[PDB]
Amino acid sequence: MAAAVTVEEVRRAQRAEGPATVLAIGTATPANCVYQADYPDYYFRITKSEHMVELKEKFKRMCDKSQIRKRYMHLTEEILQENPNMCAYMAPSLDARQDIVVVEVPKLGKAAAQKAIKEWGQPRSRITHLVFCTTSGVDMPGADYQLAKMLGLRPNVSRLMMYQQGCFAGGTVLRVAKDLAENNRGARVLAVCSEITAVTFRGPSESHLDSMVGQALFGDGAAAVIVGSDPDEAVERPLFQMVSASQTILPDSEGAIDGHLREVGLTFHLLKDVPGLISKNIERALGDAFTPLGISDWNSIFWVAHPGGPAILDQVEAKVGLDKERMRATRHVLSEYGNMSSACVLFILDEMRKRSAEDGHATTGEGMDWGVLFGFGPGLTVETVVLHSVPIT
Amino acid sequence: VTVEEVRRAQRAEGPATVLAIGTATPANCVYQADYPDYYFRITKSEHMVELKEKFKRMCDKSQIRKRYMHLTEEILQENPNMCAYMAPSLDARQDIVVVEVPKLGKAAAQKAIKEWGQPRSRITHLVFCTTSGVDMPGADYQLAKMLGLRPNVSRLMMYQQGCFAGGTVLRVAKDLAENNRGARVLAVCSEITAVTFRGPSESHLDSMVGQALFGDGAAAVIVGSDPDEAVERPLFQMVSASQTILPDSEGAIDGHLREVGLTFHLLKDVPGLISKNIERALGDAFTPLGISDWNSIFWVAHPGGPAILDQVEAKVGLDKERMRATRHVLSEYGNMSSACVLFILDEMRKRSAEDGHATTGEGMDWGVLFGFGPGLTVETVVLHSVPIT
Numbered sequence: 001m002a003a004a005v006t007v008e009e010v011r012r013a014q015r016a017e018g019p020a021t022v023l024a025i026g027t028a029t030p031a032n033c034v035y036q037a038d039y040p041d042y043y044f045r046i047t048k049s050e051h052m053v054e055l056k057e058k059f060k061r062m063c064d065k066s067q068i069r070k071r072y073m074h075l076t077e078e079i080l081q082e083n084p085n086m087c088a089y090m091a092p093s094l095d096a097r098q099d100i101v102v103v104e105v106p107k108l109g110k111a112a113a114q115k116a117i118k119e120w121g122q123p124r125s126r127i128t129h130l131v132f133c134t135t136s137g138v139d140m141p142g143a144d145y146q147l148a149k150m151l152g153l154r155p156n157v158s159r160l161m162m163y164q165q166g167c168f169a170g171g172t173v174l175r176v177a178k179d180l181a182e183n184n185r186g187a188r189v190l191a192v193c194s195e196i197t198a199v200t201f202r203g204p205s206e207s208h209l210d211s212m213v214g215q216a217l218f219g220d221g222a223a224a225v226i227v228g229s230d231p232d233e234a235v236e237r238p239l240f241q242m243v244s245a246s247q248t249i250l251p252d253s254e255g256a257i258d259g260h261l262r263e264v265g266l267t268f269h270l271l272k273d274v275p276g277l278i279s280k281n282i283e284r285a286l287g288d289a290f291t292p293l294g295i296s297d298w299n300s301i302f303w304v305a306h307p308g309g310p311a312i313l314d315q316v317e318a319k320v321g322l323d324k325e326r327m328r329a330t331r332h333v334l335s336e337y338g339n340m341s342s343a344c345v346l347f348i349l350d351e352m353r354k355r356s357a358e359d360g361h362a363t364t365g366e367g368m369d370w371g372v373l374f375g376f377g378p379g380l381t382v383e384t385v386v387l388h389s390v391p392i393t
Numbered sequence: 394v395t396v397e398e399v400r401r402a403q404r405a406e407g408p409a410t411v412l413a414i415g416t417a418t419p420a421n422c423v424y425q426a427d428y429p430d431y432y433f434r435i436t437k438s439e440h441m442v443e444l445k446e447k448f449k450r451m452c453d454k455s456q457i458r459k460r461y462m463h464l465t466e467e468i469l470q471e472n473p474n475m476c477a478y479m480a481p482s483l484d485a486r487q488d489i490v491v492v493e494v495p496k497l498g499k500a501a502a503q504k505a506i507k508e509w510g511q512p513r514s515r516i517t518h519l520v521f522c523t524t525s526g527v528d529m530p531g532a533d534y535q536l537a538k539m540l541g542l543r544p545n546v547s548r549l550m551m552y553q554q555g556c557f558a559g560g561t562v563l564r565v566a567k568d569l570a571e572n573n574r575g576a577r578v579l580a581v582c583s584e585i586t587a588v589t590f591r592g593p594s595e596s597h598l599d600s601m602v603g604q605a606l607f608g609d610g611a612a613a614v615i616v617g618s619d620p621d622e623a624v625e626r627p628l629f630q631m632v633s634a635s636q637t638i639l640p641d642s643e644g645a646i647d648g649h650l651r652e653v654g655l656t657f658h659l660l661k662d663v664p665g666l667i668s669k670n671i672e673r674a675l676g677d678a679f680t681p682l683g684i685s686d687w688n689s690i691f692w693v694a695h696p697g698g699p700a701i702l703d704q705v706e707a708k709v710g711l712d713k714e715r716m717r718a719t720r721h722v723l724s725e726y727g728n729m730s731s732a733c734v735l736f737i738l739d740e741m742r743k744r745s746a747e748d749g750h751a752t753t754g755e756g757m758d759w760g761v762l763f764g765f766g767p768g769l770t771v772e773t774v775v776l777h778s779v780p781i782t
Contacts (some may be wrong), residue, residue, distance in 0.1 A: 004683060005682050005683055005776050006409070007630055007632055008408075008630055009572070010405060010408075010633070010682070011408050011632075014633070015404075015572075018396075018397065018400060019396050019397075019399075019400050091650060092481065094651070094652050095651055095652050098649070098650070098651070112683065113533050122431070133518065134528075138527060138552065138553040138650050139553070139648075139649060139650070140524075140553060140555050140646075140647060140648035140649070140767040141647070141767040141768050141770065142553065142767075143553070145638070145768060145770070146768070148638070154675070155573070155637050155639075155640070156635060156636065156637035156638075157636075158564070158634075158635065158636045158776065159636060160551075160565065161551070161554060161559070162549075162551075163486050163527065163552040163553050164527040164528070164529060164531065164550075164552050164553075165529075165531075165615075166438045166529050166530075172549070175547065176549065176565075177574075179568040179569055179572045180568055182400070182404070183404075183567075183568040183572040184568070224744075241396050243396055243399055244399070245547075246405070246545055247545065247546075247547045247548060248544050248545035249534070249537070249544040249545075249546075251544070257529075258490075258530070259528075259529035260487070260528060260529070260530060261481050261485065261487070261527050261650075262484050263481055263484050263526070263652045288545070292394075293394050294394055306483050336476070348588065357653070377529075378529040378530040378531075378534070379530050379534060381530065383533075388396050
C-alpha cells in the first residue's frame with residue numbers, strides 16, 4: 001500500500017518531458033515610421049541643432065553606414081514638442097519619459113502578444129507563465145502585471161518581470177522560458193520583449209559621439225512567443241526547439257557597453273571595440289555550444305544574431321567565414337526595423353520561419369537542422385541559444 | 394545526437410533543495426525607540442509637532458525593535474535633496490545603491506558559499522534581486538565579478554520587483570536547479586532604503602509608513618537538485634511555487650521610480666486583502682498534497698507590517714508559535730523587502746536546531762513561504778523540511 005504523497009512523486013508528476021518548443025511568434029511596432037535617409041535632417045531639426053553643421057555631417061555618415069532603411073518610433077514630432085527637455089542632450093526628463101513608456105511598453109507588448117496568441121489558437125486561460133522583458137522604463141507593479149491584466153490572463157499566471165536588461169535579453173527571455181516550459185508539465189509560456197526608445201532619445205552633443213550612435217541605430221518594437229514542451233500536434237504547430245542556452249561575459253570587455261538610468265533618462269556609453277570583442281570570442285562560444293553536439297561547421301547551421309550594429313555582423317561573418325546567406329534574416333530585420341534591443345532576435349526568428357515557409361525550404365531554419373541564436377549586450381554579455389528547426393510540409 | 398537524447402541527459406533528477414543560507418546587514422544600526430527623534434531631527438522637521446506624534450505611534454505599533462541602514466547622518470548631510478520630501482535626488486540615490494546593493498549582496502553570498510563548502514567555480518547560475526536602483530550591466534554582473542564566479546555563470550537580474558520577490562527568486566531558482574543536471578544556483582536578495590528615504594510631509598502619511606517599516610539587508614541561498622548528502626547539507630526542499638494576483642486589489646501597493654527617487658503609495662486595506670485571500674492560497678497550494686490543517690505546517694511569511702501578520706494569524710486561526718520566526722526577523726531587522734523571507738528561513742532552521750526539534754521546520758514535515766507585494770501579488774512556495782541530522 002502507498003504512503004502519503006511524497007516530494008519525489010510530486011516532482012515526477014510535475015515535470016514536462018520534451019524540449020521547450022516555440023509554438024507561435026507575433027510582432028508589433030508603433031505606427032509612426034521614419035526613413036533612415038530622412039533621419040539626419042529630421043533629428044537635427046526637431047532638436048534645434050542645425051547650426052551644429054560638422055556634427056550633423058558625422059551623423060549623416062552614421063546613418064548612411066547603419067545599413068538601416070527605416071525605424072518605427074512611438075515618439076513623434078508632436079510628442080517631442082510637448083517635451084522640450086527630451087530634445088536636449090542631458091536635461092531632467094526621466095518623469096516625462098517614464099510617463100510615456102510605463103504605458104506604451106505594455107501596450108505595444110499587448111499588440112505583439114495578441115498576434116502570437118491568435119496564431120497559437122489556444123484559449124488565453126491555457127497560458128501558465130508570462131515572462132516580460134524591457135529596457136524601457138520601470139514601474140511597480142511592472143509591465144508584466146499590466147500586460148496580464150490587458151490580456152485577461154488567469155490571476156495565477158506565473159509572472160517574471162525582466163527590467164533594465166539591455167540588448168542581450170532576447171536571448172535571456174528564451175533561456176528563462178526554456179526552463180519554465182521544460183520543468184513544468186502543461187506549462188505554456190508567453191514571453192514578450194517590448195522596447196520603446198523614448199527613454200533613450202536625446203539631442204546631439206559634440207563630446208559624446210557614442211550617444212549619437214544610439215540615435216542612429218535604436219528603434220521601437222515588441223515581439224511575443226509562445227513556448228511549451230510536449231506540443232499537442234493535433235492543435236499546436238512547432239516552429240523551433242530549444243536545445244541549450246548559455247550566457248557568458250567576454251574577456252577584456254569591462255565597460256564596453258554601459259547604460260545608466262538617470263534623471264535625464266537612460267544614457268548609453270561605449271568604451272571598447274564591441275564588434276572586435278564579439279568577433280574575437282564568437283568562435284569559442286560556438287565551440288562551447290556545438291562541440292558537445294558533434295557540430296563544427298558554422299556554415300551548416302542557421303543563424304539568428306542580435307544586430308547591435310552592422311559592424312558586429314560584418315566582423316562576425318568575416319571572422320567565422322559565413323556564406324552571405326547566413327546573415328540574411330538578421331540583416332533584413334536590421335534594415336526594416338533597426339536595432340530594437342531585446343526584441344530583435346525574436347523578430348529575426350519570425351523572419352527566419354516566415355521566409356523558410358515562403359521560399360519552400362525543407363525546415364523552419366532555411367533547410368538546416370541546427371541553428372544558433374546570439375544576444376549581445378552590456379557585460380559584455382553573450383547569450384547563446386542552440387536551436388533545432390522543424391520540418392515544413 | 395538527437396534533441397531527445399540531449400534533454401534526458403541535461404535535466405536534473407530530484408527537487409530543488411536549499412543547501413545554505415547566509416545573511417548580512419549594513420553596520421549602522423538604529424533602535425526603533427530612537428527613530429522618531431532621530432528622523433525628525435536630521436530632516437529638520439521638529440516644528441511638525443502633530444506629525445511627529447503620528448510617526449511616533451507608527452513606530453510604536455511597528456513591532457520593530459531595530460533596523461540596519463546604510464544611510465547615515467553624514468551621508469544625508471552630503472545629500473540634502475534626499476532629506477526633502479520631494480526634491481530631485483534620483484541621481485544621488487542611484488550613485489549610492491548601484492554600488493552598495495551588490496556590495497551587501499557579496500557579504501551575504503560569501504557566508505552562504507562558506508556554509509555550502511564547495512568551490513565558487515561550482516556555481517552555475519546567479520539570480521540577483523533588488524528593488525533598490527537599476528543599472529547596466531546589472532548588480533548581477535557586479536556580484537559575479539566581485540565573487541570571481543565563472544564568466545559563463547548563467548545570470549538572471551530581477552529589478553524593481555518589491556516585497557514579494559523573495560518568493561520570486563525561490564520560484565526562479567527552483568526551475569533552474571531542477572531542469573539542469575548539476576546546477577548550483579546562487580540566489581541573492583539585497584535591499585537598501587537609500588532609494589526610498591525621504592523627509593516627512595503632513596499631506597502623505599502612507600509615505601511615512603515606509604520610513605517606519607523599511608530596513609536594509611541581504612540574504613543569499615545556494616539551491617541545487619540531487620545534493621551529495623555527505624558533503625552538501627539540505628535545509629529545505631521546494632515542492633511547488635506559484636504566484637497570483639488578489640481580486641479587488643488594484644492599486645493597493647504602487648511604487649514609482651521618479652526624479653525624486655522611489656515613491657510608494659497605499660490605496661487599499663492590504664492586511665485585509667491578504668487575510669481575506671490567504672486561505673484560498675493555502676488551499677491552492679496544499680489541496681493537491683492532501684494537506685488542510687494550517688497549524689500542522691511551518692510558516693514563513695513576508696512581514697510587510699505587523700497588521701498583515703496579526704490578521705492572517707487571526708483569520709487562519711494559527712497558534713501563536715507559527716509566526717514566531719517571522720516576527721523575530723521583523724523585530725530584529727524590520728521590513729527588508731525581498732530579503733525578509735530568506736532571513737526567516739535562516740532563523741527557522743537555526744532555532745529549530747537550537748530547540749532540538751526533529752526537523753528544520755520546527756519539527757513539522759511541510760511548510761509554506763509567502764511573499765506579499767505590488768499587485769497585490771502573492772507568491773506561495775510549498776516547502777518540505779529535512780530531518781535534523
